[PDB]
Design an enzyme around this catalytic site. Structure first.
Site, mmCIF file in Angstrom:
data_model
loop_
_atom_site.group_PDB
_atom_site.id
_atom_site.type_symbol
_atom_site.label_atom_id
_atom_site.label_comp_id
_atom_site.label_asym_id
_atom_site.label_seq_id
_atom_site.Cartn_x
_atom_site.Cartn_y
_atom_site.Cartn_z
ATOM 1 N N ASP A 2 41.052 45.418 42.895
ATOM 2 C CA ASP A 2 41.361 44.401 41.854
ATOM 3 C C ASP A 2 42.365 44.962 40.833
ATOM 4 O OD1 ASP A 2 39.835 46.110 40.314
ATOM 5 O OD2 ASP A 2 38.373 44.587 39.660
ATOM 6 N N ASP A 40 38.530 53.780 38.843
ATOM 7 C CA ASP A 40 37.296 54.507 38.481
ATOM 8 C C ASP A 40 37.624 55.931 38.033
ATOM 9 O OD1 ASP A 40 35.819 52.211 39.275
ATOM 10 O OD2 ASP A 40 35.039 53.182 41.098
ATOM 11 N N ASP A 75 22.465 47.933 31.546
ATOM 12 C CA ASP A 75 23.110 46.594 31.440
ATOM 13 C C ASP A 75 22.465 45.574 32.375
ATOM 14 O OD1 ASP A 75 23.968 46.693 34.047
ATOM 15 O OD2 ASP A 75 26.122 46.947 33.471
ATOM 16 N N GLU A 126 29.948 60.254 44.116
ATOM 17 C CA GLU A 126 31.031 59.539 43.391
ATOM 18 C C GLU A 126 32.258 60.419 43.252
ATOM 19 O OE1 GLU A 126 31.359 56.528 42.700
ATOM 20 O OE2 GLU A 126 29.334 55.647 42.777
ATOM 21 N N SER A 162 41.853 47.705 38.948
ATOM 22 C CA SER A 162 41.120 48.638 38.062
ATOM 23 C C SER A 162 41.083 50.026 38.713
ATOM 24 C CB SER A 162 39.751 48.121 37.730
ATOM 25 O OG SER A 162 38.945 48.053 38.874
ATOM 26 N N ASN A 197 40.744 50.773 42.536
ATOM 27 C CA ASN A 197 39.968 49.636 43.090
ATOM 28 C C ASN A 197 40.951 48.565 43.597
ATOM 29 O OD1 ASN A 197 37.425 50.871 42.425
ATOM 30 N ND2 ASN A 197 37.733 50.208 40.309
ATOM 31 N N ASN A 205 34.434 52.470 35.770
ATOM 32 C CA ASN A 205 35.450 51.457 36.114
ATOM 33 C C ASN A 205 36.116 50.914 34.855
ATOM 34 O OD1 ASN A 205 36.841 49.328 37.289
ATOM 35 N ND2 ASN A 205 35.119 48.604 38.506
#
Ligand code: NA
Ligand SMILES: [Pt+2]
EC number: 3.2.1.17
Length: 129
Positions: free
Chosen positions: A48, A52, A101, A35, A50, A46, A59
């Site tokens: 969209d 990270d 989650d 990562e 967003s 990202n 995110n």
């Protein structure tokens, strides 16, 4: 801060990630290598809009507020900059909510594609833990 491999393994262990939701420490060390290259200051945009953040590339779409991801959630209740600190506490505490989650470590694309199903114990070999 760019961690060493065993240095990060020791910090992640101290903060309770070894076997957290059943994922061995090597899974977490492997995820952080791919990562972020163990770099707490890593950021990546990202598609969209967003971003990270930090050693586990958390995110802003769901997990933190960066002031530029409109309509998004802040489920870790932190500024995204908290995820870039030399102190990994905020990243580890938020990673525990993410992995809890329902999708487990599949939330981390690099884990799914480069760590899942591999000899992840190699990532902690040689370390005094
Ligand atoms: Na957000
Ligand atoms: Pt901790």
């Amino acid at each position: 801060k760019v961690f060493g491999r065993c240095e990060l393994a020791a910090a992640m262990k101290r903060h309770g990630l070894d076997n957290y939701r059943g994922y061995s420490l090597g899974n977490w060390v492997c995820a952080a290598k791919f990562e972020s290259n163990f770099n707490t200051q890593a950021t990546n945009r990202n598609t969209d809009g967003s971003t990270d953040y930090g050693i586990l590339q958390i995110n802003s779409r769901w997990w933190c507020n960066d002031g530029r991801t409109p309509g998004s959630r802040n489920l870790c209740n932190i500024p995204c900059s908290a995820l870039l600190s030399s102190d990994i506490t905020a990243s580890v505490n938020c990673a525990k909510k993410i992995v809890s989650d329902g999708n487990g470590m599949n939330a981390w694309v690099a884990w799914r594609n480069r760590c899942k199903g591999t000899d992840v114990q190699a990532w902690i070999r040689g370390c005094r833990l």
